[PDB]
Design an enzyme around this catalytic site. Structure first.
Site: not given
Ligand SMILES: Nc1nc2c(ncn2[C@@H]2O[C@H](COP(=O)(O)OP(=O)(O)OP(=O)(O)O)[C@@H](O)[C@H]2O)c(=O)[nH]1
Ligand SMILES: [Mg+2]
Ligand SMILES: Nc1nc2c(ncn2[C@@H]2O[C@H](COP(=O)(O)OP(=O)(O)OP(=O)(O)O)[C@@H](O)[C@H]2O)c(=O)[nH]1
Ligand SMILES: Nc1nc2c(ncn2[C@@H]2O[C@H](COP(=O)(O)OP(=O)(O)O)[C@@H](O)[C@H]2O)c(=O)[nH]1
Ligand SMILES: [Mg+2]
Lengths: 136, 49, 430, 431, 431
Positions: D11, D63, D132, D136-137, D171, D198, D220, D246
């Protein structure tokens, strides 16, 4: 096609004489008259048949033709605007266009299918190293 | 020298002809987009009816 | 007659050549479409030295542009006077070297060299009588420093009796732009010293410094740098293309300058060179020209020539002057500076005169000096090389492409031997 | 002739990629529908033959919410309809689920898509990947993709823009586990990794942008600006160009050490951007300023190995060299001994573009630095400390054990991180 | 002066005939009433002297419903009223009905119609016949018609477009019997046969057209498109024209082996057609993609014998042959050893059309390939197994016995399929 490339051999055989007998140029005048002759021969062909700073190009889009499209999904109220949709609501205005644009053009190298190896057979001939008068 | 330079004069005309041929190739290229635009707009609205 | 063929590679070399060809075309009055609009007859007597005649009557440079990435040549073609180059002579790759000497000398360049050496063979054979070859390249880059030197070796193996001239840009430790510069610099110089007949060093740092000091120009750029180096290159062979009081070609310079086969590294300079506001203030004469050429601040290398002694020096003059005046000027300058001139060779200054001046100027001079002061660049480059090499930094690539540390050790030893031998004559006495 | 493929997974990856592709289309003038109203877009796009353009990107998630939002939002027409791959069940922060249970049925289709996209390009330079790490995913699919691609393509360069959890703000409560696992996975498979925690970017947004109300949109947009500044050399002419090949020329001393951290300058709002002249020396000093570093790490705590900076705008080589001279003069910033010169600087003519409705002010000169320094061991140390605090009593372990992962698998990750820390500490010493 | 006579028999034959005859009149601009709005058509139609044109088609059936629908539909004015031959009773999927009892009284009228049609034509190449194998009347009438024609006309070529039962999808329960009987009959009599089972077309429609609930109309439109792509070389100018007699002279190594399976590309809907180049290389790769066969057989499970493909549009021989070289380079496609070259290429200028109310979108380049490959033995094997399982206990045999058909007949068909399978296995081995 042109007529000049129709002239053929056996016509070079005796055909009048270019200068009238009464108007012979004399020695000293010919001897001083070499330079215009030479420059005539050498760059007759160059004048007849032979004939900074970076610059930015204009940006591809003009503002009056942005024509931004509406979303397919019809949102009813401002309350339900989601946090993913802010990207791209606002059309660019006069302020946001970049003033200068410096692209890369690859049309010249989008050619030359492949590099060449001369798959040929010498034909180099020799020019000798000193005073070519003795090379065969 | 006159006849030789006439020959190069002919060669320049040959370049001009082949350049016009390249422009003709570009005009041919236009055809695909000219078809595509309207063709696919109508074909996409077809399922909408 | 006694013509030479130009070859350039790497983007630095291509930018050098783009300005060199523009300068020479302006000198001979050749428009960028290849048509003549000059005034003097002497402008075209020896045009075959650099140009070849094409049907229709235009002149084309006999230049071989080579590169491992096509963006550089796509850029130079769009630049002014880009139409002159024949499309055939361009040779380029699709991958690049990424400043990697191993990649540019063993992996990609080895396969790509076939076509470029073939076109060199064809073009060189085509001309009447070979005089020599000239190359321009930067030693700070992988593709340049590797492929250029490998091609130098290949051309030398095929034409042993010809002369080869090289304009090498060296990575100065002051204005450093890449971390792997010392590696490929040493690796290139090892092969260069064995093959190249003459090598003349140019330093970006020194070019920039003279631009700031004697030009006093606010915002110098690569364009002005290329202009300076281009005027310097043209001054070397001007007397070859034009008659003069003392005609002197590259072979004569080679015989006159190098006492021994392995001491063929020179540093050069150009004069007069004044700020734009003081151009009408100065008084262009032979004494001023010679004090300017011998000024240490005018040399285009970072080396301080007063830290060592000159082996030989030579000056090329453009414009009509009395030869005797130049003669006693050289004599007096050598007489008072006997401390800075090696003694076991008397009268170690050569001078040549050519009667044609540069366009817009009335006198000009190009200076070349074979001196022992250049050892400092080699010492500092070797010092940085060993500082990086002791901890085995960045060596993993060069290990991974068929190369190993044995020839690195050999290159360091050879470079040290060269420095020691070059210094040995500095303390030599009669 | 030069092409690069972008991968977004997770995500966070999707929400970053949406912003980055907004900026790319704005920069190259391509309208959101994909139809324009010489060839510079070839870096990131492909011509359809007649009319619109197709991005060279792939979006992955398990998802469907974010994928559906993408497929319905204003940028719908732009993407190919069959490159936004969506699963059905989320891994739910369980790296075991996303690396052994569900991702194995989506990775196949992902690789077919990647192969079909790489077939179109002829001069493939490399891959960018966004994910990120605290998800998990994200972690699982990213790791699986890297392991598969590194053996399918071999020597092709890959750049991973990972968002590591902040030292104290996070989070979830399980993210150290999958962070360690994914770090172990990528250590032997990615050529370049960039730190993007972050908290530091939040600090920058609150301080310089003077925004007391920051959200992920600003985050972003900043990351997108960094990407554009990094890639400008591939699609814009400049006095001094650089290729993605390079970068490991100057940033990777040894194959194990390939984690670097970024910074950007200048950062200022339009309400006070026009009260200063913004010299190159000033912006490059703000670049090396420790608090402007995009990663929550202190450069003053360790040596530098090597830095590479990109300038875009109307900068001058004398300006750059004079600034670097003063930087080398400075005493507080110390480099590693065996690196006499460690700077790689590039110049590009194209000034940075501004996004309408954004926060960043439009500035004519910008600098983006990537630095590799010995100080990176601290984040690994704190992550290892957090991991030990939880694994000391086998907390949460059964959730990973019940998804096919073996019990011992944490031990190898722990040992590999220990080896990484010792390697940094031993390369940081003087000879 | 080139003509070909079209025969439609059985419900499947009639239902594909309607679709193909709509396509032909759309090709030649003829309205359904038969008029022309104010020479290429001469292959399929004949001039009435003043006004309309008559298709060179005959419809035969023992089932009055479909014939009545044709005679009452919009195309009621096109066909000649006395060439829509209809019977009184249906065969009820019983082969003996249509081959021994009820078709004998209608075959005479059919042959009289055929003679009258052939007398008008002067340069006929042969016959195209459409029938369903899983239908009693279709199989019986097809067998009887082929046996009659093969002695009546002699060396004229005949092409049978037969729709075989799917591996497991089917509508009847007795169809293996009539299938084996029809194979026995037409093995000796048909010069070229085409396999067109339904399940593969279902898969094509699902994957490409993205239609989740399609019907037989889409299948018939696809079949009509294939037939038009086959026959365009006789009625349109092309750089390399191929005739009907130019197909068997390349596609039949030995007299027994004359069953081929087809593929067509591209198959793309307009919702995503304009997102890609539709390039020659990618379409010719799609042609050899195993999933794009309209016959449910795996080409990878056997060697190839001979491939003949026709391109239509703005194709260039450079592009075509460069693609063929890449195909030959590819490893996963292997040809039999004694066939060093196996490609028969055709090039035509006429692009394929779009039928209003259809699903397909037309494109500037289309390719249709016919392949004879050794992998076809699997369908015969599975049908033989289905036959044996039922005939083990003499199931349903008595209704074939009680209509004049002798019991021993099934043994001969079984042993001939055994011989055919042995022949394929023998020819599949290398030297
Ligand atoms: N910099 C930044 N980090 C994000 C953002 N959205 C989520 N994260 C980071 O992503 C981490 C968790 O993963 P998510 O992006 O929420 O979701 P995911 O990586 O698809 O994993 P799942 O939740 O299991 O589906 C959090 O600890 C956030 O720090 C974003 O919009 N900007
Ligand atoms: Mg996610
Ligand atoms: N592709 C396709 N196949 C069809 C269609 N209609 C019937 N079939 C096939 O025909 C087979 C059975 O024969 P039918 O056409 O139904 O009937 P028949 O051949 O006239 O024989 P009878 O039932 O005795 O009249 C079935 O297995 C179907 O697969 C159609 O519209 N399209
Ligand atoms: N004189 C001059 N030197 C240049 C120019 N551009 C780059 N350089 C020099 O080239 C060096 C870098 O060379 P490099 O890019 O590695 O060459 P490559 O290996 O062929 O790619 C820098 O140190 C610059 O000093 C230019 O326009 N003029
Ligand atoms: Mg029926």
């Amino acid at each position: 096609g042109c007529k000049a490339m129709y002239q053929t051999t056996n016509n070079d055989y005796g055909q009048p004489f270019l200068q009238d007998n009464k108007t012979v140029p004399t020695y000293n005048e010919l001897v001083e008259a070499q330079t215009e002759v030479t420059r005539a021969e050498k760059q007759l062909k160059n004048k007849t048949v032979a004939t900074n700073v970076i610059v930015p190009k204009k940006f591809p889009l003009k503002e009056d033709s942005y024509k931004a499209p509406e979303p397919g999904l019809k949102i009813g109220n401002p309350l339900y605007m989601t946090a993913n949709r802010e990207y791209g609501m606002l059309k660019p205005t006069a302020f946001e266009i970049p003033n200068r644009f410096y692209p890369k053009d690859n049309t010249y190298s989008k050619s030359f299918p492949g590099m060449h190896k001369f798959d040929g057979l010498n034909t180099n001939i020799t020019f000798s190293k000193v005073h070519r008068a003795l090379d065969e | 020298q006159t006849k030789k330079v006439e020959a190069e004069l002919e060669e320049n005309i040959l370049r001009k002809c082949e350049e016009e041929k390249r422009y003709e190739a570009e005009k041919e290229r236009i055809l695909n987009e000219q078809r595509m635009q309207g063709r696919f707009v109508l074909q996409q609205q077809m399922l909408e009816k | 007659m006694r013509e030479i063929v130009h070859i350039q590679g790497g983007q630095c070399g291509n930018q050098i050549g783009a300005k060199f060809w523009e300068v020479i075309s302006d000198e001979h009055g050749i428009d960028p479409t290849g048509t003549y609009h000059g005034d003097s007859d002497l402008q075209l007597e020896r045009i075959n030295v650099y140009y070849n005649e094409a049907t229709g009557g235009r002149y084309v440079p006999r230049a071989i542009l080579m590169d491992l990435e096509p963006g550089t040549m796509d850029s130079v073609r769009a630049g002014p006077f880009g139409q002159l180059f024949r499309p055939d002579n361009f040779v380029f790759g699709q991958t690049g070297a990424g400043n990697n000497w191993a990649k540019g000398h063993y992996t990609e360049g080895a396969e790509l060299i076939d076509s470029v050496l073939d076109v060199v063979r064809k073009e060189a054979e085509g001309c009447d009588c070979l005089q020599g070859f000239q190359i321009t390249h930067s030693l700070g880059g992988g593709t340049g420093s590797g492929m250029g030197t490998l091609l130098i070796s290949k051309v030398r193996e095929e034409y042993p009796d010809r002369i080869m001239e090289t304009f090498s840009v060296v990575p100065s430790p002051k204005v450093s732009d890449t971390v792997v510069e010392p590696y490929n610099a040493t690796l290139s110089v090892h092969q260069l010293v064995e093959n190249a007949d003459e090598c003349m060093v140019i330093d970006n740092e020194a070019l920039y410094d003279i631009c700031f000091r004697t030009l006093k120009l606010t915002t110098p750029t690569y364009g002005d740098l290329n202009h300076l180096v281009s005027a310097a290159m043209s001054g070397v062979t001007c007397c070859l293309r034009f008659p003069g009081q003392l005609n002197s070609d590259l072979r004569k310079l080679a015989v006159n300058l190098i006492p021994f086969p392995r001491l063929h590294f020179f540093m050069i300079g150009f004069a007069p060179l004044t700020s734009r506001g003081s151009q009408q203030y100065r008084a262009l004469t032979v004494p001023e020209l010679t004090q300017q050429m011998f000024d240490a601040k005018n040399m285009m290398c970072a080396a301080d020539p007063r830290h060592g002694r000159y082996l030989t020096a030579s000056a090329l003059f453009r414009g009509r002057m009395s030869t005797k005046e130049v003669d006693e000027q050289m004599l007096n300058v050598q007489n008072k500076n006997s401390s800075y001139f090696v003694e076991w060779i008397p009268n170690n200054i050569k001078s040549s005169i050519c009667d044609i001046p540069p366009k817009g100027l009335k006198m000009a001079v190009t200076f070349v000096g074979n001196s022992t002061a250049i050892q400092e660049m080699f010492k500092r480059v070797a010092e940085q090389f060993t500082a990086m090499f002791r901890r085995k930094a960045f060596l993993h690539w060069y290990t991974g492409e068929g190369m190993d540390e044995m020839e690195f050790t050999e290159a360091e030893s050879n470079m040290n031997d060269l420095v020691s031998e070059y210094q040995q004559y500095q303390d030599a006495t009669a | 002739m030069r092409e690069v493929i972008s991968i977004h997974v997770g995500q966070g990856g999707i929400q970053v990629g949406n912003a980055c592709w907004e900026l790319f289309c704005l920069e190259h003038g391509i309208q959101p529908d994909g139809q324009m109203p010489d060839d510079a877009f070839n870096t990131f796009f492909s011509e359809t033959g007649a009319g619109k353009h197709v991005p060279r990107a792939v979006f992955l998630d398990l998802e469907p919410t974010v994928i559906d939002e993408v497929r319905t939002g204003t940028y719908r027409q732009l993407f190919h309809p069959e490159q936004l791959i969506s699963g059905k069940e989320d891994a739910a922060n369980n790296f075991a689920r996303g690396h052994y249970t569900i991702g194995k049925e989506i990775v196949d289709l992902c690789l077919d898509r990647i192969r079909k996209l790489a077939d179109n390009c002829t001069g493939l330079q490399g891959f960018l990947v966004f994910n990120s790490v605290g998800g998990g995913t994200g972690s699982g699919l990213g790791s699986l993709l890297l392991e598969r691609l590194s053996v399918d393509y071999g020597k092709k360069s890959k750049l991973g823009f990972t968002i590591y959890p902040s030292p104290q703000v996070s989070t979830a409560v399980v993210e150290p586990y999958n962070s360690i696992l994914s770090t172990h996975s990528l250590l032997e498979h990615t050529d370049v990794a960039v730190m993007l925690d972050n908290e530091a970017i939040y600090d920058i947004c609150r301080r310089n942008l003077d925004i007391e109300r920051p959200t992920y949109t600003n985050l972003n947009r900043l990351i997108a600006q960094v990407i554009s500044s990094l890639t400008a050399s591939l699609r814009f002419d400049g006095a001094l160009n650089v290729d993605i090949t390079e970068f490991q020329t100057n940033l990777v001393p040894y194959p194990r050490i390939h984690f670097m951290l970024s910074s950007y300058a200048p950062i200022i709002s339009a309400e006070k951007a026009y009260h200063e002249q913004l010299s190159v020396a000033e912006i490059t000093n703000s670049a090396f300023e420790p608090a402007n570093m995009m990663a929550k790490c202190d450069p003053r705590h360790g040596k530098y190995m090597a830095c590479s900076m990109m300038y875009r705008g109307d900068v001058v080589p004398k300006d750059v060299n004079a600034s670097i001279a003063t930087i080398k003069t400075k005493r507080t910033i110390q480099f590693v001994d065996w690196c006499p010169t460690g700077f790689k600087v590039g110049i590009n003519y194209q000034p940075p573009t501004v996004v309408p409705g954004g926060d960043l002010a439009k500035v004519m000169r910008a600098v983006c630095m990537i630095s590799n320094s010995t100080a990176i061991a601290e984040v690994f140390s704190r992550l290892d400390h957090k991991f030990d605090l939880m694994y000391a009593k086998r907390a949460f372990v059964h959730w990973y054990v019940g998804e096919g992962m073996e019990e011992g698998e944490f031990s190898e990750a722990r040992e590999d991180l220990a080896a990484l820390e010792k390697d940094y500490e031993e390369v940081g010493i003087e000879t």
